[PDB]
């Protein structure tokens, strides 16, 4: 299957009450493997997946060094962005950064990422060519010219197309029993009357990994996209995922509706009808 | 592994 390694960083300024709260998390697909919290006691990058624990002290020293440096950059960026937007010194603001790489099922490099957000909105992002920048507004154009002069893209591209991808392949191997598995969803359907003429049919998908799934309803082979209540895919908390999809049907016409389940664990997609 | 690069400020 397709795989990814992504790092996520969030810095939230708290003026008057000290230095910004910095949080860094690392993921291989939908599994977190590292973490850093500026308010935690260790002041170290810590393991979060059993397959990363086997890395020696030099690995953790380097990760702790680079993660504290990432946090310092964001601390300075918070002050700058406040000036770019003529914002008050007392308010709390957020910078977010995301970067990483993807590999296809052939394990060859597919995509690199490096993007930045200020206060939950796009600020600057590296384009798919790993050479150009997309600046969201006028303030981001100042940063864009600064990063072009400093040749930031040339440096990021060497990491994304090489280092990022080599370490992702090594993590996929070290964690092969969890990272390279497919848990097919366990499905069921519930039925609840809502009037003398209507009932809700809820199609369930549970204990699946990875999170990528399609759960849809049809009535006589026609998509029910508008009449479908769908929940966002949620973590079970044990490394698996859950999702449901519901439709309001006329009682007696339950057999005209089919729920369709699509997942890597299912060789052939599933068609499910209400079973009284 | 994190990117071993001193980022440029905004």
């Amino acid at each position: 299957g397709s795989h990814s390694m992504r790092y996520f960083f969030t810095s939230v300024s708290r003026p008057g009450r000290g230095e910004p709260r910095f949080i860094a998390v690392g993921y291989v697909d939908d599994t977190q493997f590292v973490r850093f919290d500026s308010d935690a006691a260790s002041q170290r990058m810590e393991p979060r997946a059993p397959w990363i624990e086997q890395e020696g002290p030099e690995y953790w020293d380097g990760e702790t060094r680079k993660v504290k440096a990432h946090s310092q950059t964001h601390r300075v960026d918070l002050g700058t962005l406040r000036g770019y937007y003529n914002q008050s010194e007392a308010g709390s603001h957020t910078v977010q950064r995301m970067y990483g790489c993807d590999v296809g099922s052939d394990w060859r490099f597919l995509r690199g990422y490096h993007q930045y957000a200020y206060d939950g909105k796009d600020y600057i992002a590296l384009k798919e060519d790993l050479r150009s920048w997309t600046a969201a507004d006028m303030a981001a154009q100042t940063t864009k010219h600064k990063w072009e002069a400093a040749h930031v893209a040339e440096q990021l591209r060497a990491y994304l197309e090489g280092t990022c991808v080599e370490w992702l392949r090594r993590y996929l191997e070290n964690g092969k029993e969890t990272l390279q598995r497919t848990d097919a969803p366990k499905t069921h359907m519930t039925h609840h009357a809502v009037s003398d003429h209507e009932a809700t049919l809820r199609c369930w998908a549970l204990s699946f990994y990875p999170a990528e799934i399609t759960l849809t309803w049809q009535r006589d082979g026609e998509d029910q996209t508008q009449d479908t209540e769908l929940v966002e895919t949620r973590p079970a908390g044990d490394g698996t995922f859950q999702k449901w999809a519901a439709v309001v049907v006329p009682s007696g016409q339950e057999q005209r509706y089919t729920c369709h389940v699509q997942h890597e664990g299912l060789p052939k997609p599933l068609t499910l009808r209400w079973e009284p | 592994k994190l990117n071993d690069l001193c980022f440029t400020n905004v």
Partner: protein, 100 residues
């Protein structure tokens, strides 16, 4: 600035069974800013030993957190998740619908 309300899901790790040990989850997502107050409730009272995932976010930059606690469901006990955020006039309480 632009603020986003948390979406809230209350559910169990495993299919619920009275008398059987399980985990009660409260997944908050799609919110901004990241400052959020999430409590798990047993018959309206706070649960003291509640853990949570490390702060992370989606492609759209909106944040997500999973709050979880060990629990043994019974027929009498009602579970809920109470969330407070800058976007909420009052805290939002979402009940655990025992199966769905």
């Amino acid at each position: 600035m632009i603020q986003r309300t948390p979406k809230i899901q209350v559910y169990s790790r495993h299919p619920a069974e009275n008398g059987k040990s399980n985990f009660l989850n409260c997944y908050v997502s799609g919110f901004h800013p990241s400052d959020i107050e999430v409590d798990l409730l047993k018959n309206g009272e706070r649960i003291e030993k509640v853990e949570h995932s490390d702060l992370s976010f989606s492609k759209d930059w909106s944040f997500y957190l999973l709050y979880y606690t060990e629990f043994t469901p019974t027929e009498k006990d009602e579970y809920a998740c109470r969330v407070n955020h800058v976007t909420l006039s009052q805290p939002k309480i979402v009940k655990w619908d025992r199966d769905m």
